[PDB]
Design an enzyme around this catalytic site. Structure first.
Site, PDB file in Angstrom:
ATOM      1  N   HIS D 202       0.757  -1.253   0.000  1.00 41.32           N
ATOM      2  CA  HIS D 202       0.000   0.000   0.000  1.00 41.32           C
ATOM      3  C   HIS D 202       0.782   1.294   0.000  1.00 41.32           C
ATOM      4  O   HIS D 202       0.224   2.334  -0.332  1.00 41.32           O
ATOM      5  CB  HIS D 202      -0.952   0.034   1.176  1.00 41.32           C
ATOM      6  CG  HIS D 202      -2.010  -1.011   1.107  1.00 41.32           C
ATOM      7  ND1 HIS D 202      -2.947  -1.186   2.102  1.00 41.32           N
ATOM      8  CD2 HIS D 202      -2.285  -1.938   0.160  1.00 41.32           C
ATOM      9  CE1 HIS D 202      -3.755  -2.178   1.771  1.00 41.32           C
ATOM     10  NE2 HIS D 202      -3.374  -2.651   0.598  1.00 41.32           N
ATOM     11  N   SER D 206      -0.272  -0.803  -6.263  1.00 41.86           N
ATOM     12  CA  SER D 206      -0.049  -1.881  -7.210  1.00 41.86           C
ATOM     13  C   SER D 206       0.698  -1.458  -8.467  1.00 41.86           C
ATOM     14  O   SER D 206       0.489  -0.393  -9.048  1.00 41.86           O
ATOM     15  CB  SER D 206      -1.380  -2.510  -7.617  1.00 41.86           C
ATOM     16  OG  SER D 206      -2.079  -3.004  -6.496  1.00 41.86           O
ATOM     17  N   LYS D 228     -13.953  -8.387  -9.667  1.00 40.98           N
ATOM     18  CA  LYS D 228     -12.941  -9.098 -10.444  1.00 40.98           C
ATOM     19  C   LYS D 228     -12.284 -10.212  -9.632  1.00 40.98           C
ATOM     20  O   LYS D 228     -12.044 -11.305 -10.153  1.00 40.98           O
ATOM     21  CB  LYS D 228     -11.865  -8.151 -10.976  1.00 40.98           C
ATOM     22  CG  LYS D 228     -11.027  -8.793 -12.071  1.00 40.98           C
ATOM     23  CD  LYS D 228      -9.737  -8.036 -12.308  1.00 40.98           C
ATOM     24  CE  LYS D 228      -8.892  -8.683 -13.406  1.00 40.98           C
ATOM     25  NZ  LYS D 228      -9.413  -8.414 -14.786  1.00 40.98           N
ATOM     26  N   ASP D 229     -12.003  -9.941  -8.358  1.00 42.80           N
ATOM     27  CA  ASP D 229     -11.390 -10.945  -7.498  1.00 42.80           C
ATOM     28  C   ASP D 229     -12.353 -12.096  -7.208  1.00 42.80           C
ATOM     29  O   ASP D 229     -11.971 -13.263  -7.273  1.00 42.80           O
ATOM     30  CB  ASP D 229     -10.914 -10.310  -6.189  1.00 42.80           C
ATOM     31  CG  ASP D 229      -9.643  -9.500  -6.367  1.00 42.80           C
ATOM     32  OD1 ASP D 229      -9.048  -9.058  -5.354  1.00 42.80           O
ATOM     33  OD2 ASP D 229      -9.237  -9.308  -7.535  1.00 42.80           O
ATOM     34  N   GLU D 272       5.538 -33.937  -2.345  1.00 43.50           N
ATOM     35  CA  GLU D 272       4.349 -33.609  -3.113  1.00 43.50           C
ATOM     36  C   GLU D 272       4.845 -32.790  -4.294  1.00 43.50           C
ATOM     37  O   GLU D 272       5.938 -32.230  -4.254  1.00 43.50           O
ATOM     38  CB  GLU D 272       3.404 -32.768  -2.293  1.00 43.50           C
ATOM     39  CG  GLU D 272       2.618 -33.537  -1.286  1.00 43.50           C
ATOM     40  CD  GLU D 272       1.628 -34.456  -1.935  1.00 43.50           C
ATOM     41  OE1 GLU D 272       1.087 -34.073  -3.001  1.00 43.50           O
ATOM     42  OE2 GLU D 272       1.385 -35.546  -1.366  1.00 43.50           O
TER      43      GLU D 272
HETATM   44  C1  HEM Z   1       0.624 -16.321   1.314  1.00 40.62           C
HETATM   45  C2  HEM Z   1       1.381 -15.016   1.214  1.00 40.62           C
HETATM   46  C3  HEM Z   1       1.021 -14.075   0.262  1.00 40.62           C
HETATM   47  C4  HEM Z   1      -0.203 -13.498   0.186  1.00 40.62           C
HETATM   48  C5  HEM Z   1      -1.467 -13.947   0.944  1.00 40.62           C
HETATM   49  C6  HEM Z   1       0.067 -12.346  -0.715  1.00 40.62           C
HETATM   50  C7  HEM Z   1      -0.855 -11.374  -0.974  1.00 40.62           C
HETATM   51  C8  HEM Z   1      -0.689 -10.326  -1.829  1.00 40.62           C
HETATM   52  C9  HEM Z   1      -1.773  -9.441  -2.180  1.00 40.62           C
HETATM   53  C10 HEM Z   1      -3.194  -9.444  -1.630  1.00 40.62           C
HETATM   54  C11 HEM Z   1      -1.257  -8.660  -3.159  1.00 40.62           C
HETATM   55  C12 HEM Z   1      -2.004  -7.653  -4.004  1.00 40.62           C
HETATM   56  C13 HEM Z   1      -2.705  -8.225  -5.239  1.00 40.62           C
HETATM   57  C14 HEM Z   1      -1.747  -8.891  -6.205  1.00 40.62           C
HETATM   58  O1  HEM Z   1      -1.043  -8.171  -6.936  1.00 40.62           O
HETATM   59  O2  HEM Z   1      -1.690 -10.137  -6.219  1.00 40.62           O
HETATM   60  C15 HEM Z   1       0.145  -8.952  -3.261  1.00 40.62           C
HETATM   61  C16 HEM Z   1       1.012  -8.230  -4.004  1.00 40.62           C
HETATM   62  C17 HEM Z   1       2.357  -8.527  -4.138  1.00 40.62           C
HETATM   63  N1  HEM Z   1       2.948  -9.658  -3.587  1.00 40.62           N
HETATM   64 FE1  HEM Z   1       2.206 -11.016  -2.420  1.00 40.62          FE
HETATM   65  N2  HEM Z   1       1.352 -12.340  -1.279  1.00 40.62           N
HETATM   66  C18 HEM Z   1       1.892 -13.487  -0.807  1.00 40.62           C
HETATM   67  C19 HEM Z   1       3.136 -13.956  -1.197  1.00 40.62           C
HETATM   68  C20 HEM Z   1       4.060 -13.289  -1.966  1.00 40.62           C
HETATM   69  C21 HEM Z   1       5.312 -13.852  -2.447  1.00 40.62           C
HETATM   70  C22 HEM Z   1       5.909 -15.239  -2.207  1.00 40.62           C
HETATM   71  C23 HEM Z   1       5.879 -12.901  -3.173  1.00 40.62           C
HETATM   72  C24 HEM Z   1       7.028 -13.024  -3.959  1.00 40.62           C
HETATM   73  C25 HEM Z   1       8.364 -13.559  -3.541  1.00 40.62           C
HETATM   74  C26 HEM Z   1       4.982 -11.781  -3.149  1.00 40.62           C
HETATM   75  C27 HEM Z   1       5.181 -10.622  -3.884  1.00 40.62           C
HETATM   76  C28 HEM Z   1       4.258  -9.599  -4.085  1.00 40.62           C
HETATM   77  C29 HEM Z   1       4.539  -8.334  -4.766  1.00 40.62           C
HETATM   78  C30 HEM Z   1       5.848  -7.890  -5.371  1.00 40.62           C
HETATM   79  C31 HEM Z   1       3.357  -7.697  -4.857  1.00 40.62           C
HETATM   80  C32 HEM Z   1       3.138  -6.502  -5.748  1.00 40.62           C
HETATM   81  C33 HEM Z   1       2.157  -6.835  -6.847  1.00 40.62           C
HETATM   82  C34 HEM Z   1       2.155  -5.810  -7.957  1.00 40.62           C
HETATM   83  O3  HEM Z   1       1.374  -4.834  -7.852  1.00 40.62           O
HETATM   84  O4  HEM Z   1       2.933  -5.967  -8.928  1.00 40.62           O
HETATM   85  N3  HEM Z   1       3.838 -12.058  -2.472  1.00 40.62           N
HETATM   86  N4  HEM Z   1       0.493 -10.052  -2.521  1.00 40.62           N
HETATM   87  C1  IKR Z   2       7.854 -34.391   5.833  1.00 35.41           C
HETATM   88  O1  IKR Z   2       8.109 -34.553   4.451  1.00 35.41           O
HETATM   89  N1  IKR Z   2       7.159 -33.818   3.717  1.00 35.41           N
HETATM   90  C2  IKR Z   2       7.329 -33.940   2.441  1.00 35.41           C
HETATM   91  C3  IKR Z   2       6.362 -33.194   1.541  1.00 35.41           C
HETATM   92  O2  IKR Z   2       6.329 -33.361   0.324  1.00 35.41           O
HETATM   93  O3  IKR Z   2       5.599 -32.368   2.295  1.00 35.41           O
HETATM   94  C4  IKR Z   2       4.627 -31.596   1.561  1.00 35.41           C
HETATM   95  C5  IKR Z   2       8.380 -34.752   1.775  1.00 35.41           C
HETATM   96  C6  IKR Z   2       8.029 -36.105   1.423  1.00 35.41           C
HETATM   97  C7  IKR Z   2       8.984 -36.945   0.785  1.00 35.41           C
HETATM   98  C8  IKR Z   2      10.274 -36.424   0.506  1.00 35.41           C
HETATM   99  C9  IKR Z   2      10.636 -35.097   0.847  1.00 35.41           C
HETATM  100  C10 IKR Z   2       9.682 -34.231   1.496  1.00 35.41           C
HETATM  101  C11 IKR Z   2      10.061 -32.828   1.860  1.00 35.41           C
HETATM  102  O4  IKR Z   2      11.059 -32.380   0.949  1.00 35.41           O
HETATM  103  C12 IKR Z   2      11.239 -31.019   0.860  1.00 35.41           C
HETATM  104  C13 IKR Z   2      10.754 -30.172   1.912  1.00 35.41           C
HETATM  105  C14 IKR Z   2      10.946 -28.783   1.825  1.00 35.41           C
HETATM  106  C15 IKR Z   2      10.358 -27.977   3.043  1.00 35.41           C
HETATM  107  C16 IKR Z   2      11.628 -28.247   0.701  1.00 35.41           C
HETATM  108  I1  IKR Z   2      11.918 -26.230   0.591  1.00 35.41           I
HETATM  109  C17 IKR Z   2      12.103 -29.081  -0.334  1.00 35.41           C
HETATM  110  C18 IKR Z   2      11.919 -30.467  -0.274  1.00 35.41           C
HETATM  111  C19 IKR Z   2      12.440 -31.303  -1.392  1.00 35.41           C
END
Ligand code: HEM
Ligand code: IKR
Ligand code: PEE
Ligand code: HEM
Ligand code: BOG
Lengths: 101, 47, 48, 380, 61
Positions: D202, D206, D228-229, D272
């Site tokens: 914020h 965005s 939209k969402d 998985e």
């Molecule tokens: C479960 C955790 C997360 C939730 C619930 C979450 C939620 C959000 C929400 C609600 C937005 C705004 C809408 C959108 O653009 O999608 C957002 C934006 C963003 N999120 Fe996340 N996010 C998560 C994980 C991550 C991860 C893993 C990354 C990347 C390493 C990340 C990077 C970003 C960035 C850079 C924005 C800016 C979007 C833009 O306007 O370009 N988020 N996220």
């Molecule tokens: C307890 O094992 N859980 C597993 C799984 O798939 O959970 C969703 C599992 C089952 C069999 C072999 C390896 C794993 C976990 O392996 C992992 C776990 C994490 C965190 C990462 I980063 C990267 C790898 C490769």
């Protein structure tokens, strides 16, 4: 020979921001330098750039583009900000170097 | 004709012409803060 | 292994029907609102 | 105060100033729906999880059966169970597109918003990891074993950091109980941090598909993106439920329908789908430690993306070169995922190290390079 | 014209609109369920216990 020209003209058409009616400089990411630069643009060039963009956004929201006729053409693209931008960077590099001094 | 009007009458007449209608809007100047026809359209209903 | 087998598939059905019905409606609603931006037209009028 | 109680109230002003009168770009696409899905997705896991935790017994002697009991005896327990396990997937699917989108449209330039995201990802990964151990099936046990066993490869503080995590000498009840607690906990940490993530967001607002000031044309979050969402929700939710209601185990390993047993190592221990890619890079480097670092960095690499941006433009919309490189990477990942599901034998082993090799190259060398070269082609 | 009738009658007054949704959901449920079960069952003639039930229900031992 004209290789660089062919390439540049190619990549230019490849990128395709003209399809939106944007100039090259219209697409620059607005980092700190670019920001100062835009502030120096003459009222008109600034308003023209403004509309150009808002136009391209409304296109992107609509999921459309300009009709082939209106696409900016590689050699008719006016690099309006680059002269300014380079100065901003010059000035800064000066200040920058002078302060280490 | 004016002494004929009572609250009840005003409500029914305004509802008739105002409530839930899609309006026409004209904005001129530094209007960035006023926005979205949608939002304005939704202002056409509920107390 | 999965006593629920049956009920789970009867459910899967109800899920698709509702899902179909609902996704359709919501698509309309989404489109209906955005229509204001989708149709929208704009012109640049400097005071030349 | 102010006229409408929406902007004055100390709370309604929050709901309002972050989901209703919130300024959003007029053109953000579908790749911007994942943020909300991720959020929604989160609430749903926590809800299904609690409901399951109310019938679970964290003890090696009852773990496997408590779950079975939950499915076989608890009203709709069988359903709740599915949704939860499958919800984990929806979660990852959603989170990977969320990331992809960020990479492609340079959203990572929003450094804090980004780094918190990375932290979110990491936390989510740990969460599913511990969660997977809970049903105490064969894979649960050996997965726990394989992975936790890697730490013993760290120097000096190794063999100790492990017999500490296990709370013993091998994965046993002590481990199970702390994993349940950890799994019950992390989701809240996630929610917590998710708040921070949206807060930094914020600040800037965005980003958008073109990568140019969208102040020239902003719209209120509601109704535009509310609607939209919600559409995006149903669109995705449909296959989730389809897979969850018609093909319940399409994703799950069957070895996990067999109670964990330390006197039987399964044929092929594999995670998985959402961990495969990392499992592959892990096995690419044959050297317990090196393989660990390689895994570590396969994810920690995201923290470097911001510093490896050389383009003069924010997004890849107008950089055809970066695009194919980007899609090459994506494909690079499918291959790595595929390899992760395969045994350690030629041809796989070589194909494996290759993808691994390319993965890091594409992100550390190519991207930054192609981007520079691209600037020159614009005559910049 | 139903649309107009429906509009003025139901959809205009936000209070009746919600009232419609409630009663509307009620009727929708009852029917959507019946029809679906009916579709499901028909799709599985003689496979359900509901079907084979008669063979042991009060006719044995
Ligand atoms: C479960 C955790 C997360 C939730 C619930 C979450 C939620 C959000 C929400 C609600 C937005 C705004 C809408 C959108 O653009 O999608 C957002 C934006 C963003 N999120 Fe996340 N996010 C998560 C994980 C991550 C991860 C893993 C990354 C990347 C390493 C990340 C990077 C970003 C960035 C850079 C924005 C800016 C979007 C833009 O306007 O370009 N988020 N996220
Ligand atoms: C307890 O094992 N859980 C597993 C799984 O798939 O959970 C969703 C599992 C089952 C069999 C072999 C390896 C794993 C976990 O392996 C992992 C776990 C994490 C965190 C990462 I980063 C990267 C790898 C490769
Ligand atoms: C990581 C774990 C790996 C898991 C396996 C990955 C599964 C692979 C599934 C394939 C994904 C299918 C999506 C195909 C979309 C095709 C498409 O429409 O592409 C074109 C389209 C056009 O872009 P513009 O230039 O803005 O056009 C504007 C003019 N109207 O490009 C895009 O949509 C941008 C790409 C964003 C989505 C990327 C999704 C792929 C996911 C991979 C995750 C990668 C990140 C790294 C993770 C490290 C851990
Ligand atoms: C970040 C959200 C969460 C994720 C990603 C997640 C993931 C998982 C995973 C992958 C499993 C193994 C499922 C299986 O295949 O059997 C699992 C199991 C479980 N989770 Fe979660 N979970 C989350 C939140 C929760 C929460 C908040 C609780 C409750 C406080 C919870 C309680 C449980 C329980 C009781 C199990 C054991 C039952 C089972 O094996 O299905 N989970 N979780
Ligand atoms: C277990 O019985 C189930 O009871 C449900 C009713 O609750 C039915 O709809 C299912 O078809 C039936 O299999």
């Amino acid at each position: 020979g004209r290789l660089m020209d062919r390439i540049r003209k190619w990549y230019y058409n490849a990128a395709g921001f003209n399809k939106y009616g944007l100039m090259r400089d219209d697409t620059l990411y607005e980092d700190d330098d670019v920001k100062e630069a835009l502030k120096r643009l003459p009222e008109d060039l600034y308003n023209e750039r403004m509309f150009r963009i808002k136009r391209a956004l409304d296109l992107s929201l609509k999921h459309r583009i300009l009709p082939k006729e209106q696409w900016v053409k590689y050699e008719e693209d006016k690099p309006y900000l680059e002269p300014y931008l380079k100065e901003v960077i010059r000035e800064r590099l000066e200040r920058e170097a002078w302060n280490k001094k | 004709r004016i002494s004929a009007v009572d609250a009840r009458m005003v409500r029914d007449v305004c509802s008739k012409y105002i409530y839930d209608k899609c309006p026409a809007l004209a904005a001129v100047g530094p209007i960035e803060q006023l926005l979205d026809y949608n939002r304005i359209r939704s202002g056409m209903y509920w107390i | 292994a999965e006593p629920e087998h049956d009920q789970r598939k009867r459910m899967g059905l109800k899920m698709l029907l509702i899902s179909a019905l609902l996704t359709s409606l919501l698509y309309y609603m989404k489109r209906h609102k955005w229509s204001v931006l989708k149709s929208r037209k704009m012109a640049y009028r400097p005071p030349k | 105060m102010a006229p409408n109680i929406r902007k004055s109230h100390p709370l309604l002003k929050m709901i309002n100033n972050s989901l209703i009168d919130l300024p959003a770009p007029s053109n953000i696409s579908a790749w911007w729906n994942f943020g909300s899905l991720l959020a929604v997705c989160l609430m749903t896991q926590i809800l299904t999880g609690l409901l399951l935790a109310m019938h679970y017994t964290a003890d090696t002697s009852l773990a496997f059966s408590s779950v079975a009991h939950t499915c076989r005896n608890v009203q709709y327990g069988w359903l709740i169970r599915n949704l939860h396990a499958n919800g984990a997937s929806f979660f990852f699917i959603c989170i990977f597109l969320h990331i992809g989108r960020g990479l492609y449209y340079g959203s990572y330039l929003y450094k804090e918003t980004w780094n918190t995201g990375v932290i979110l990802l990491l936390t989510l990964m740990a969460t599913a990891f511990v969660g997977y151990v809970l049903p105490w099936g064969q894979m649960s046990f050996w997965g726990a074993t394989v992975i936790t066993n890697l730490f013993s490869a760290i120097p000096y503080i190794g063999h100790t950091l492990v017999e500490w995590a296990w709370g013993g000498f091998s994965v046993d009840n002590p481990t199970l109980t702390r994993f349940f607690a950890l799994h019950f906990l992390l989701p809240f940490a996630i929610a917590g941090i998710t708040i921070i993530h949206l807060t930094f967001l914020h600040e800037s607002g965005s980003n958008n598909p073109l990568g140019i000031s969208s102040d020239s044309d902003k719209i209120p979050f509601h109704p535009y993106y509310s609607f939209k969402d919600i559409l995006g929700l149903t669109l995705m939710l449909t296959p989730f439920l389809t897979l969850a209601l018609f093909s319940p185990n399409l994703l799950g390993d069957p070895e996990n329908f067999t109670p964990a047993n330390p006197l039987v190592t399964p044929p092929h221990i594999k995670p998985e789908w959402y961990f495969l890619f990392a499992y592959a890079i892990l096995r690419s480097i044959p050297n317990k430690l090196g393989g660990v670092l390689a895994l570590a960095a396969s994810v920690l690499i995201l923290f470097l993306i911001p510093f490896l941006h050389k383009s003069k433009q924010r997004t890849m919309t107008f950089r055809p070169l970066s695009q194919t490189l980007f899609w090459l990477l994506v494909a690079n990942l499918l291959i790595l995922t595929w390899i992760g599901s395969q045994p350690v034998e030629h041809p796989f082993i070589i194909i494996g190290q290759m993808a691994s090799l390319s993965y890091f190259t594409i992100l550390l060398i190519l991207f930054p390079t192609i981007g520079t070269l691209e600037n020159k082609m614009l005559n910049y | 014209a139903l649309l107009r009738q429906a509009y003025s009658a139901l959809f205009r007054r936000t209070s009746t609109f919600a009232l419609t949704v409630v009663l509307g959901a009620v009727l929708f449920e009852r029917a959507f369920d019946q029809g679906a079960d009916a579709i499901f069952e028909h799709l599985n003639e003689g496979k359900l216990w509901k079907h084979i039930k008669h063979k042991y229900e009060a006719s044995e031992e």
